[PDB]
């Protein structure tokens, strides 16, 4: 009576993850990227509810490897010092067991070990190494251009619209773009620079609150500005200035949010409590200079909810040129420094904060900052987006004639 | 021109078919040769994907047609539902959540009836 009927142009997505190309408008973007598109290009959807998660996205790793493809072709260090951890002369470790006498005197004496299940030596063994590499060095300029990440053929990038978007949860006002908004490659520990802000109000996140080990991202609505310059009498000295009473209002509404939602406690701010010094300082690259600026006096807002240069707050800042790679593990040396003076006016847009939850008398919570991940600094600009795969084939049982 | 395949999602299926009809009726240096060929590469890739799904419909006797009447009857265990609920109470999401193992089997039976 009525049978199978084939339809083309069928609105059903999937969630496959693919390579997604670039960009908007002479080394990388010439070779890797496309020109712009005449935006606007949006399709508003109606009664859909697409489930968004930010912390399980797979636009992050593609973009992270893509900026690895940027900065080993645009800002080449003179020398790269990377690990080389290998399992000399042989593959003597074999499948498993114990004994095996390698290492001690130089790298070729005997060190017959004992195991019989395995767990690792120097689980299974690795004798590590250090590949040192020298790369060229033209004094190359740098500027993070906006990168409109455009979806390939037969794919879509879904996008939320509500301004209180917590990353997780479902979004109802789901739109569809063909290509993303303005995204700039700005690596910055300790602080977010040149990011896109929020329309309605500030937002506080985590991958997991109460776990006190995931980088709490705070994204602002007030475009706070920052000014690092290099004046003199010294060659490698610089400083930043930030507007006080913009910073008091910003910290006030941040602690207002954190007190109206998650505690219910007392606040206390502090500095990064140690480790490798690219997290203790606000680190950012600007014009070919790797500014490491001290970030103690910004963080003091010990505030019941109810002597440090109170108007022109100065951040003493060193220029260092033997840097730890965020790209992989290891260090890198660049060209010798610059002679002139560099302007680095930028937008403070967010914060990478952590916790140290406890302890029963307190009562307070020590709310030291963190950062150091650069993938976390992409989850704030890969903010709405979800890669979905269309399939336009459908099957419906109609009459048909 | 394949962007607007999904503008009627969330709505029901006959309104989506009418929207398909409406949307189908509605539509000197090295920098030159670098920013010129990738446009043509995207055009050729879109054309080849479209032609790929065109012959994928053409193996079933459905080449070019958005809506085509094929020749495979039911199995009555393929969503034994009244036509009113079929076209007014369920979107596409419920149904390609519902019959995927069955749509593989319908792919096989449409190929077998297409050769004979």
């Amino acid at each position, epitope marked *: 009576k009525k049978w199978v009927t084939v339809y083309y142009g069928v609105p059903v997505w999937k*969630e496959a993850t693919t390579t997604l190309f670039c960009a908007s408008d002479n080394v990388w973007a010439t070779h890797a990227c496309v020109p712009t598109d005449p935006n606007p290009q949006e399709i508003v959807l109606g009664n859909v509810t697409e*489930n968004f998660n930010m912390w399980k996205n797979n636009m992050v790793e593609q973009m992270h490897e893509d900026i690895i493809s940027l900065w080993d072709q645009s800002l080449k260090p003179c020398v790269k010092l990377t690990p080389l951890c290998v399992t000399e002369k042989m593959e003597t470790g074999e499948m498993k067991n114990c004994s095996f006498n390698v290492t001690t005197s130089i790298r070729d004496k005997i060190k017959k070990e004992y195991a019989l299940f395995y767990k690792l030596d120097v689980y299974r063994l690795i004798n590590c190494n250090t590949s040192v590499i020298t790369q060229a060095c033209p004094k190359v300029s740098f500027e993070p251009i906006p990168i409109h990440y455009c979806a390939p053929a037969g794919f879509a990038i879904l996008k939320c619209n509500s301004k209180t978007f*917590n990353g997780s949860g*479902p979004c109802t006002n789901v739109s569809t773009v063909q290509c993303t908004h303005g995204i700039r490659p700005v690596v910055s520990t300790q602080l977010l620079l040149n990011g896109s802000l929020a329309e309605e109000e500030i937002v506080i996140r985590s991958e997991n609150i109460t776990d006190n080990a995931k980088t709490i991202i705070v994204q602002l609505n007030e475009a706070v500005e920052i000014n690092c310059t290099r004046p003199n009498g010294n060659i490698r000295q610089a400083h930043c200035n930030i507007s006080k009473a913009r910073w008091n209002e910003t910290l006030g509404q941040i602690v207002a949010k954190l007190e109206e*939602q998650f505690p219910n406690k007392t606040i206390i701010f502090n500095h990064s409590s140690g480790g490798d010094p690219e997290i203790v300082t606000h680190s950012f690259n600007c014009g070919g200079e790797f500014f490491y600026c001290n970030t103690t006096p910004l963080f003091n807002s010990t505030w019941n909810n109810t002597t440090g240069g109170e108007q022109n707050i100065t951040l003493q800042c060193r220029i260092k040129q033997i840097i730890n790679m965020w790209q992989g593990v290891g260090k890198a040396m660049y060209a010798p420094p610059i002679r002139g003076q560099i302007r680095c006016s930028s937008n403070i847009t967010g914060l990478l904060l952590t916790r140290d939850g406890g302890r029963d008398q307190n009562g307070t919570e020590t709310f030291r900052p963190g950062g150091g991940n650069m993938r976390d600094n992409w989850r704030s600009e890969l903010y709405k987006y979800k890669v979905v795969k269309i399939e336009p084939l459908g099957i419906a049982p109609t009459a048909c004639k | 021109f394949i962007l607007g395949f999904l503008g009627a999602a969330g709505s029901t299926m006959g309104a989506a078919s009418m929207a398909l009809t409406v949307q189908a009726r509605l539509l000197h240096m090295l920098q030159l040769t670098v920013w010129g060929i990738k446009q043509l590469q995207a055009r050729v890739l879109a054309v080849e994907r479209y032609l790929r799904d065109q012959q994928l419909l053409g193996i079933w006797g459905c080449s070019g047609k958005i809506i085509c009447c094929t020749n495979v009857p039911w199995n009555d*265990s393929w969503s034994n539902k009244t036509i009113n609920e079929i076209w007014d109470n369920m979107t596409w999401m419920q149904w390609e*959540k519902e019959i995927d193992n069955y749509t593989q089997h319908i792919y096989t039976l449409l190929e077998v009836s297409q050769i004979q």
Partner: antibody, heavy 131, light 107 residues
Framework: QIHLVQSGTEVKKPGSSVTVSCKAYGVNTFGLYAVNWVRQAPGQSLEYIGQIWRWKSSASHHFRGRVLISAVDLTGSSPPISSLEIKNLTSDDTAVYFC??????????????????????WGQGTLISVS | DIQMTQSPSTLSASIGDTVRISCRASQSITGNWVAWYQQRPGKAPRLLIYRGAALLGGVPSRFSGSAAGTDFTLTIGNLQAEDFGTFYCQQYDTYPGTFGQGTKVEV
């Protein structure tokens, strides 16, 4: 992992109310996860009660008005906690109660059909009897 | 609703049985919106099988099942000492579904 744990085991006088508490460790939030509620008479088959699918609390239609559900997102020092409000304690509501969770994440899982779901993990149940 | 009926309601089985349990439906469930649950006495009735023919990762690879329109078949393969459980079959097609009756296996 999900190590869903409820509150203690009580016993009740008739004609009262009770809020059963189910804590939810290992849960992101109730946007990607939905809380369904089951009861069990001591010696019968299991029995559906309710849902918090996409923050829309609803019990079933044979069981309206008496027992209705609330849910609390993770806050600061608190994991996500679903609570169950039971009115008009009769003599035959004596049962072991269960809270469940499911994954709402992808549409094409098969663990959910428009709020009609299979139940992924399970608590430990609380017995309520009548003196 | 749509009434389910598990059968047989009680059997006994030696160690290493292929126990085949049917679960009847009043309507004809197309799309296979049925799940299989196991409950041992006192603990949590964990899920075994969703969508009729899909095995959960935490459940071992010894359980299976199939569909017969109104019937659904649960199959134990190589019954071990730990799977002596009262079984259940949920229909989760329409709102709200109900479960089976039980199969309390013995020896």
């Amino acid at each position: 992992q999900i190590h869903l744990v409820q509150s203690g085991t009580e016993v009740k006088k008739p004609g009262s109310s009770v809020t059963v508490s189910c804590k939810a460790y290992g849960v992101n939030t109730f946007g990607l996860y939905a809380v369904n509620w089951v009861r069990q008479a001591p010696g019968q088959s299991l029995e559906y009660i309710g849902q918090i699918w996409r923050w829309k609390s609803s019990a079933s239609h044979h069981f309206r008005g008496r027992v209705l559900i609330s849910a609390v997102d993770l806050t600061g020092s608190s994991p996500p906690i679903s609570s169950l409000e039971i009115k008009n304690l009769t003599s035959d509501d004596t049962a072991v109660y269960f809270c469940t969770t499911t994954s709402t994440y992808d549409k094409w899982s098969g663990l959910h059909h428009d709020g009609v779901m299979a139940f992924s993990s399970w608590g430990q149940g609380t017995l309520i009897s009548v003196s | 609703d749509i009434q389910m009926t598990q059968s047989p309601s009680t059997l006994s089985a030696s160690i290493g049985d292929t126990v085949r349990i049917s679960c009847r439906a009043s309507q004809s469930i197309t799309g296979n919106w049925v799940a299989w649950y196991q409950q041992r006495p006192g603990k949590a009735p964990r899920l075994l099988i969703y969508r009729g023919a899909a095995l959960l990762g935490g459940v071992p690879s010894r359980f299976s099942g199939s569909a017969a329109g109104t019937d659904f078949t649960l199959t134990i393969g190589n019954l071990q000492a730990e799977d002596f459980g009262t079984f259940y079959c949920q229909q989760y097609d329409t709102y709200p579904g109900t479960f089976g009756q039980g199969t309390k296996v013995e020896v």
